[PDB]
């Protein structure tokens, strides 16, 4: 990304610049490693100790330690890792092109998959900071709300940011209301994260505070979301059922 005086004030540009830097560095690392592996397989290059260990891991499907620099599920094979790599780099290319074309102003309207970010918690913090800067409110006074919209082209409000790739484990969302379901996972459509001034509103009995885990392992928690219950189901049933949200499957 092309850093400038105007765009550095945007928290979103700072987050995406850090993400692009980390992704580019890891991309060069993996590309060099794979080029060396292909050279070894052709007989051009000899097997060094590090290279020999790399062939040992790649042949068995083990992810090498040299490749893991962002949080991922433990025990992942290499194909899933490189596929997630391709998706993340394509997202980074798209956001970089958007920044170059329309400046930082387009970073708000772009729909970012939190699964495709190396640290989506920073993205949530950046959205909070952007809303605080735009509306001149303190960061403490802002609280998060979620709107699930199935309509294509749902316009985003000034304080609303689009997200994609969310998965809902243990529940189905209809009319922005949860219902217990027997499906293992349901793909959430475009999800609008909206920051609003924290009104002194009583916590409704029909509100459940689900987590938003980074991935299916549920090792890392990004944030929490309050959702309304469609029926008269006990919220405790959602806790016993282990209902949750994952940025990526």
């Amino acid at each position: 990304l092309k850093r400038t005086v105007e765009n550095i004030k945007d928290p979103l540009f700072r987050f995406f610049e850090r993400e692009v830097k980390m992704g580019a560095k890891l991309l060069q690392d993996v590309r060099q490693d794979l080029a060396d592996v292909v050279q070894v397989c052709e007989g051009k290059k000899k097997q060094t100790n590090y290279l020999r260990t790399l062939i040992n891991e790649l042949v068995k499907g083990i992810l090498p330690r040299s490749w893991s620099h962002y949080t991922v599920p433990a025990g992942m094979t290499v194909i899933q890792w490189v596929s997630d790599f391709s998706e993340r780099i394509k997202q980074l290319q798209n956001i970089s092109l958007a920044a170059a074309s329309g400046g930082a102003k387009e970073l708000k309207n772009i729909h970012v998959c939190l699964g495709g970010l190396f640290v989506p918690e920073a993205y949530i913090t950046a959205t909070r900071q952007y809303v605080a800067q735009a509306n001149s409110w303190s960061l403490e006074e802002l609280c998060l709300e979620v709107n699930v919209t199935t309509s294509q082209g749902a316009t985003l409000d000034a304080c609303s940011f689009g997200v994609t790739g969310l998965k809902l484990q243990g529940a189905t969302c209809n009319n922005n209301k949860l219902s217990l379901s027997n499906a293992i996972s349901t793909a959430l459509p475009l999800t609008q994260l909206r920051w609003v001034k924290q009104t002194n509103t009583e916590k409704k009995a029909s509100v459940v505070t689900l987590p938003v885990y980074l991935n299916f392992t549920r090792a890392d928690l990004i944030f929490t979301v309050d959702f309304e219950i469609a029926t008269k189901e006990d919220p405790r049933s959602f806790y016993e059922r282990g209902v949750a949200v994952l940025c990526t499957e």
């Binding site: 499907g61 094979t77 027997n182 293992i184 549920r218 928690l221 806790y239 282990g242």
Partner: protein, 450 residues
């Protein structure tokens, strides 16, 4: 039989095949993941017409939603010649991997049954017969390493075998420098006199185990000499000792019923039988609670955010807490009303001190709070209380109406053998999740062996 190298290559590295973005079509009845699986499987020449055949099959959905699809996989692969039974088995394995990975292990068992015999895996699904193995298949100088998962003790098996064979056995617990001297003296006596020696919890002494392996390599033991080493599965055990010993892995039998039976057996009868009469019922609830959290650990990350060590120490602490609080409240009364039980003290302590201390995630703490609030309450003493509601979506489990320990133990013994995740509050499909995880855990493991 042909090698079936290509089919096994797809079985182990089918995901390695690449699907171009947008190349995956939508197929009626198949989810997105099944669509990617079918597209990957279509690369092989036998499954080239797989998508059209799946679309044309009217009875596909009943197979896809079936509880045991592996037994009746439809014929979809195209064959130029009729296939051998093993060819049908591997093709069915590929189809089950593509459509119902949750049943893959079951399908895998059938493949083994198709190749190595029906009774091949059966002998492991049986009680361990240590008598013949130790008598015939174990030399005196090869130590019998009985490794257990943490929290499970297997010395009872060796004591039972020693009782059955009528052989004197000397058992020493290695937990201090003195125990090393006692073990050395006992082994020096038994190696000459041919006695049986057992060393308990030897994982606590890795270096001494290396010394014992070096010592064992040099001895000329008597024929009837046997050395059992009971330990917990830890990586600190020496590699050479495992290499130079007979390893037997003991795990607890999964299920709430066995868990409650083990808890009741472990607790002394006098402790539960103490006055007031209500104490036993609380113990039953505590036992049920300790079962529900423990079995749920199998279904992580769904059951819990991470695998906590809810072991016997927590159970003993909970029992001590219950004993202290009931002794304080009752003051020796033979009976106390259910209302007078200090429910708040028990809920708070087992929510923060006994079991909650290990819990670091706030959400798991919330789940533990929900379980304790649901179970530990005055309504537990009502005859209509339901330990688990909507079991299987239609049935429920009721509290036992008895008051003595024997009534609860009989109720546990009379529980149904068929346990689903709904007993623990999880949804039934959680089982369908766990198997598929293990299913992937199978293939990846085989990739490390390929």
């Amino acid at each position: 039989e042909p090698t079936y190298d290509a089919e096994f290559q797809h079985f182990l590295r089918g995901n390695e095949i690449v699907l171009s973005a947008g190349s995956t079509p939508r197929i009626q009845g198949l989810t997105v993941e099944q669509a990617e699986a079918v597209v990957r499987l279509s690369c092989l020449p036998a499954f080239k017409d797989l998508i059209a055949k799946v679309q044309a099959d009217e009875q596909f959905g009943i197979w896809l939603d079936s509880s045991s699809p592996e037994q009746t996989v439809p014929y979809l692969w195209s064959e130029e010649t009729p296939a051998t039974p093993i060819g049908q088995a591997i093709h069915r394995l590929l189809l089950i991997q593509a459509f119902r990975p949750d049943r893959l292990l079951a399908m895998a068992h059938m493949f083994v049954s198709t190749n190595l015999g029906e009774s091949f895996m059966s002998i492991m699904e049986q009680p361990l017969d240590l008598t013949h193995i130790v008598g015939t298949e174990v030399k005196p100088n090869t130590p019998v390493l009985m490794c257990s998962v943490p929290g499970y003790d297997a010395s009872g098996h060796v004591e039972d075998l020693a009782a059955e064979q009528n052989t004197q056995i000397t058992s020493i617990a290695i937990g201090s420098a003195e125990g090393f001297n006692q073990a050395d003296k006992a082994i020096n006596t038994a190696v000459k006199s041919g006695r049986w020696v057992m060393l308990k919890n030897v994982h606590l002494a890795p270096g001494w185990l290396m010394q014992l392996e070096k010592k064992l390599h040099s001895l000329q033991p008597h024929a009837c000499f046997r050395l059992f080493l009971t330990m917990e599965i830890n990586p600190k055990v020496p590699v050479n000792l495992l290499r130079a010993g007979r390893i037997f892995v003991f795990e607890p039998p999964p299920g709430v019923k066995a868990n409650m039976l083990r808890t009741f057996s472990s607790i002394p009868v006098s402790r539960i039988c103490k006055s007031p009469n209500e104490r036993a019922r609380l113990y039953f609830l505590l036992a049920w609670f300790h079962a529900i959290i423990q079995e749920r650990l199998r279904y992580a990350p769904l059951g819990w955010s991470k695998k906590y060590e809810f072991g016997e120490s927590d159970l003993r602490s909970a029992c001590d807490t219950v004993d202290t609080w009931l002794d304080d409240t009752a003051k020796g009364r033979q009976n106390i009303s259910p209302d007078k039980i200090p429910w708040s003290a028990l809920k708070t302590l087992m929510a923060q001190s006994i079991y909650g201390g290990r819990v670091d995630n706030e959400f798991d703490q919330r789940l533990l709070n929900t379980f304790l609030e649901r179970l530990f309450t005055t309504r537990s003493f009502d005859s209509e209380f339901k330990l688990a509601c909507k079991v299987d979506g239609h049935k429920d489990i009721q509290m036992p109406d008895g008051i003595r320990r024997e009534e609860f133990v009989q109720w546990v013994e009379l529980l149904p053998d068929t346990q689903t995740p709904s007993w623990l509050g999880l949804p039934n499909n959680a089982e369908r999740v766990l198997l598929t995880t293990q299913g992937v855990d199978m293939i990846s493991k085989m990739l490390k062996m390929q």
